[model samples]
Target: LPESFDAREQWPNCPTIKEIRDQGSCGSCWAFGAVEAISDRICIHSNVNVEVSAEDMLTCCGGECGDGCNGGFPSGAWNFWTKKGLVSGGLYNSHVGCRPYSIPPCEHHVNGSRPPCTGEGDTPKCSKTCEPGYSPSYKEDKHFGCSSYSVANNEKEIMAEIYKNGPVEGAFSVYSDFLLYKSGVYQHVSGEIMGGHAIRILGWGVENGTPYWLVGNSWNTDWGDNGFFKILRGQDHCGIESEIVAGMPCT
Candidate 1:
């Protein structure tokens, strides 16, 4: 293993690694994180550069995955991929895939070009059909995963998993200060508990005297460091290391 590593640099062929998504005001970070990691793994292992739709995972997984948009499980999302599969999709309005995200990106922070989120939207109705005019039928366009598992909370183990399989999904406790995060290895200095948040962990490296996990957020590129942020590593700060989840793509 390298002392420092980045999945984007390791697998430049996988464009999803560099993609930053948005969940708007919905609590679908769970779906976004899982789908993002799965998409990256799919390209990394099979050279299939397709984004598995977060929309399908969020709305179609049913009650076992948790309430859609209102929040879901990272592990359950991967399990659904292995069992039900997901269709190719792209960002909102991109139209490059079968089912592009329907919900538009909103400004989650205090300032951005997009308007601030007005309120949470209800979960989209689960759809069994593909976008209009798309070639492949919904069933035929699906991508499947072969396995899903949670990585041990051990720092070295988590690092090894990401180093080997690309990015992994992680859930962490978010404090109020997290909303004000601009840069640096975040360690949750002062804030009230906000809620649980999920993100894609893509790499690790040391900055100044701090070791950090490089992660991608779902709050659009304007939210953090271009929709990416570094969190304190090695100590399981905010249980981020504890809830690491990942899966293998079906080739």
Candidate 2:
């Protein structure tokens, strides 16, 4: 584990992007990313290589903070971490029947079990107003709120939280300009694109002596840096910072 917890050091050693892609669409990007880091740390701690399935956590850890496939905060996820003590290399065979569902089977098979970790609060039920054909049972928690473009102090705090904890669920107003960044670094050259929810924020760096953050996007590799991006460190263009202030999880 990292002592100072610098993202530059911590993120590099963390599991590769392959593990993240293997898990189906659970919608619990927050949980997936957070647990990914946790599992990686556990493996590092034990000096054993183990791959934990995000779907298992999603199916089992729901309602602890809010609802299943609805929305949840990072703090609620942390609570779940203390309770369940996840099983390593748990089977998430949802790709067959569910096809796109992210939730793992309820009856998870584990090589060995550890002490149970428990917490209070019902797992939130999936909200009814999601897009058509979207199955709540297959979905995971998400956060939604105002999108901030210009960065602020709170964004920095959120960044720090991600560095210390892991990827935090977030949404942004994707405008037409956002679609322009084809490869390499992202300059936000274009204006406002479309408004939608996306998972981003890989790490921070300095460009031309100016601070900026590297963001991982889900739009695919053809986009900026193969679905990754770079944005001004403190400037939250398009209300990205305000969205964080609203505390909305994209469910």
Candidate 3:
């Protein structure tokens, strides 16, 4: 493992936010978030910047664990990592044509459309049919909501774990207020925040002596410094450090 990693420092020369949009009509945040992390990691690993296909992971990695798009945990994704090893298997637009199972050439217009792809039960079957290389390997602890101070000890433990192991996935509810985070910095907003979703934690770092967890988002490159955001370290916002233990993989 690398001794220390920082996003702003690592990619200081990268692009910043231009716009913030919604995932509209889709419940496939798990795929969106996971792919966001993968995209960042791909850029880090390959040193090449490119937009990855969340739709590919979404339509494919569905149904294997829970149901289609409704919800699935990050550990479930880790399970796919254990099995198929999500390589650069090419980009997918969304859950439209390409006949679902057959890998099609990358299309941008189809990728821009909102999700809720296929019908109700179709998402899972479509996901399985699409990516035969994936398999489920782990289940995760699910927390229903977020509250203040829920993440302090967990953050410390997760940081220690990252020090020993590497990055881990986490979930959070993105209410309308979170939308106010359109700028790279987050400020609490007042509204009926309606979305509950997941994202990945690549690492942690301190800003001006205050700690913040590095998180990956999926609204696209135009959103928040290329779909990435930072949550205050100890506030427990989005259950930052509470989702998984770091060091050893779950037994």
Which candidate number has the best TM-score? Answer: 1
lDDT of 2 by residue, 31-112 (tens): 5444445544443344343344444445556666444444444445545555543333233342321222333322111111
lDDT of 3 by residue, 33-94 (tens): 55444444444444344333344455555555354457665655545444443433223333
Query: Candidate 1 lDDT, tens digit per residue, 1-251?
Result: 78789999999888889999988768899999999999899999996688789889888998878998788889999999999999988888888688888888899875868878865788988898888899799999989899999999999999999998889999999998999888998989889998888899999999998999999999999887888999999999999898999999876
Decreasing TM-score order of the candidates = 1, 3, 2
Q: Give lDDT for model 3.
A: 0.45
Give lDDT: candidate 3, residue 93.
38
Candidate 1 lDDT score relative to the true structure: 0.90
Collision pairs in model 3: 59-127, 175-193, 176-193
Off by over 4 Å in 1: none
Q: Which candidate should be chosen as best, given lDDT against the real structure?
A: 1
The TM-score values for the models, in the order shown, are 0.98, 0.50, 0.57
Residue 61 Cα positional deviation in candidate 2, in Å, after optimal superposition: 2.1
Computed on alpha carbons, the lDDT of every model, listed in order, comes to 0.90, 0.43, 0.45
Q: Please give the lDDT score at residue 98 for candidate 1.
A: 80
Segments of candidate 3 deviating more than 4 angstroms: 1-4, 7-25, 35-57, 60-64, 83-87, 93-153, 184-189, 245-251
> In terms of TM-score, which candidate is stronger, 1 or 2?
1
